[PDB]
Design an enzyme around this catalytic site. Sequence first.
Site, mmCIF file in Angstrom:
data_model
loop_
_atom_site.group_PDB
_atom_site.id
_atom_site.type_symbol
_atom_site.label_atom_id
_atom_site.label_comp_id
_atom_site.label_asym_id
_atom_site.label_seq_id
_atom_site.Cartn_x
_atom_site.Cartn_y
_atom_site.Cartn_z
ATOM 1 N N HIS A 102 -30.305 54.168 -13.337
ATOM 2 C CA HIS A 102 -30.426 52.774 -12.918
ATOM 3 C C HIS A 102 -30.402 52.588 -11.401
ATOM 4 O O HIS A 102 -30.835 51.536 -10.920
ATOM 5 C CB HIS A 102 -29.276 51.928 -13.464
ATOM 6 N N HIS A 327 -31.611 39.349 -11.459
ATOM 7 C CA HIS A 327 -31.581 40.768 -11.758
ATOM 8 C C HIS A 327 -30.617 41.496 -10.824
ATOM 9 O O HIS A 327 -30.300 42.665 -11.063
ATOM 10 C CB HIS A 327 -33.010 41.342 -11.685
HETATM 11 O O1 LIG Z 1 -30.502 46.345 -14.754
HETATM 12 C C1 LIG Z 1 -31.014 46.026 -15.861
HETATM 13 O O2 LIG Z 1 -31.016 44.813 -16.230
HETATM 14 C C2 LIG Z 1 -31.682 47.092 -16.762
HETATM 15 C C3 LIG Z 1 -31.399 47.081 -18.125
HETATM 16 C C4 LIG Z 1 -31.990 48.018 -18.963
HETATM 17 C C5 LIG Z 1 -32.877 48.943 -18.424
HETATM 18 N N1 LIG Z 1 -33.546 49.936 -19.241
HETATM 19 C C6 LIG Z 1 -33.560 49.884 -20.690
HETATM 20 C C7 LIG Z 1 -34.538 49.390 -21.567
HETATM 21 C C8 LIG Z 1 -35.779 48.786 -21.299
HETATM 22 C C9 LIG Z 1 -36.891 49.264 -21.972
HETATM 23 C C10 LIG Z 1 -38.143 48.707 -21.762
HETATM 24 C C11 LIG Z 1 -38.305 47.655 -20.877
HETATM 25 C C12 LIG Z 1 -37.204 47.159 -20.205
HETATM 26 C C13 LIG Z 1 -35.950 47.717 -20.416
HETATM 27 O O3 LIG Z 1 -34.880 47.184 -19.714
HETATM 28 N N2 LIG Z 1 -34.063 49.615 -22.791
HETATM 29 C C14 LIG Z 1 -32.851 50.211 -22.704
HETATM 30 C C15 LIG Z 1 -31.954 50.649 -23.700
HETATM 31 N N3 LIG Z 1 -30.802 51.215 -23.345
HETATM 32 C C16 LIG Z 1 -30.501 51.383 -22.056
HETATM 33 C C17 LIG Z 1 -31.389 50.954 -21.070
HETATM 34 N N4 LIG Z 1 -32.552 50.374 -21.437
HETATM 35 C C18 LIG Z 1 -33.157 48.960 -17.070
HETATM 36 C C19 LIG Z 1 -32.559 48.043 -16.237
HETATM 37 C C20 LIG Z 1 -32.932 48.132 -14.763
HETATM 38 O O4 LIG Z 1 -33.519 47.195 -14.196
HETATM 39 O O5 LIG Z 1 -32.647 49.173 -14.125
#
Ligand SMILES: O=C(O)c1ccc(Nc2c(-c3ccccc3O)nc3cnccn23)cc1C(=O)O
Length: 438
Positions: A102, A327
């Site tokens: 992240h 965000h």
């Molecule tokens: O910060 C945030 O709000 C954030 C939250 C989730 C993230 N990834 C993600 C996704 C996903 C899949 C596809 C399209 C968008 C998605 O979000 N699905 C999951 C499942 N489990 C863990 C993480 N997942 C990324 C970020 C970010 O922006 O880094």
Amino acid sequence: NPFQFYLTRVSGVKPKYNSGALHIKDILSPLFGTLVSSAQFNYCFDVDWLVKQYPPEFRKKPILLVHGDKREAKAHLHAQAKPYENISLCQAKLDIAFGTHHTKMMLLLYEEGLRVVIHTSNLIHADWHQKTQGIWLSPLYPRIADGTHKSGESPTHFKADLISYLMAYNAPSLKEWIDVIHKHDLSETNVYLIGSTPGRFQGSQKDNWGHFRLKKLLKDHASSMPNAESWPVVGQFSSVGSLGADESKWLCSEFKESMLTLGKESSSVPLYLIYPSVENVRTSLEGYPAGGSLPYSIQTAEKQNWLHSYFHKWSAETSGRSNAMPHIKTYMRPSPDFSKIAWFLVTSANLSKAAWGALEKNGTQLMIRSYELGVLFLPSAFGLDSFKVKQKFFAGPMATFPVPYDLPPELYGSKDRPWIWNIPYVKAPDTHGNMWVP
Ligand SMILES: O=C(O)c1ccc(Nc2c(-c3ccccc3O)nc3cnccn23)cc1C(=O)O
């Protein structure tokens, strides 16, 4: 301001609300430095878009993309980058199940020095268009003269802590950047680094990462005040993980306990969680599609309805951004009347055990699944006992901290619901005339 805390530009608010905001094109401009190379740590990338954000004269300088994608996602990212011969990639190891890379960070090496940017936006158009996102800009760090032996370290230990964060990847492309950082003088840095890296930490390493890292810094570098029990904790995020069947499992037992630490001595502390309601998203600049970046699944939510009694609406009149969905993630410790704060954190970490860590092994081991990175503003690091809260985010005694949303936070009304991204909303249309059908 000494804080160098910025919001991204929002298309559609009045110029007054973008005056001191930064677009990614501003960050990469030649005015910030003559770019030699860069590393882009992130989650999601639109490589075609990203290269267009660099100035034309810098678009062939080397770029390292640090990501956590695997299998077909990894292949897709390599395909995006293959047309650009100057782009290299680093796959962050994610050896614990259900972890995510992240961390959002730019390392910008110039002819004139080095800059570090820790922020909250993915490298895609929509994350810089109509969202509320946060940016911390390091000062321009000068290079240490060849032959000179000095630490280049700050009172906040930022240089060593950033190298330690990068060393956890065990990556050859990042050892190159560690060597770059070693050669620069980061002594002017006034923020503390708070990172998460995947692993199981015990003993000395327990305090290195996640919410134990935050706890350790608050114990060592903040002071407890009388009536500290009346100073709330505020958490503000864009995604929610599975926290357990009740608040005792994690939220109020180890997470809140770390957050309420102040000083070195041994709860009724109010906990405000800020997370967009359905109505927040519907009436937003983007409309329901903003909810595609607020990932809270019904499968998670239905197991923890108790949590939503902590939820407060997104509101940001102070920065003209009530309709620019968040965000950014922030955590802070305001006074009972919200006029001061004991500290402020901007980070990539959402409200999840994966991000912050969960104790295992009878309390002896902190298990973290994900990479996260943020910076912590402590009054002690600025010669202060607390920060006054800036009244209007873009207005103008520059030792007041620019909190980007409204205080006090406003509780959900009885008809409000938390945004849950994978159920439909077909009862009222959004700002573009559409419903939400997943
Ligand atoms: O910060 C945030 O709000 C954030 C939250 C989730 C993230 N990834 C993600 C996704 C996903 C899949 C596809 C399209 C968008 C998605 O979000 N699905 C999951 C499942 N489990 C863990 C993480 N997942 C990324 C970020 C970010 O922006 O880094």
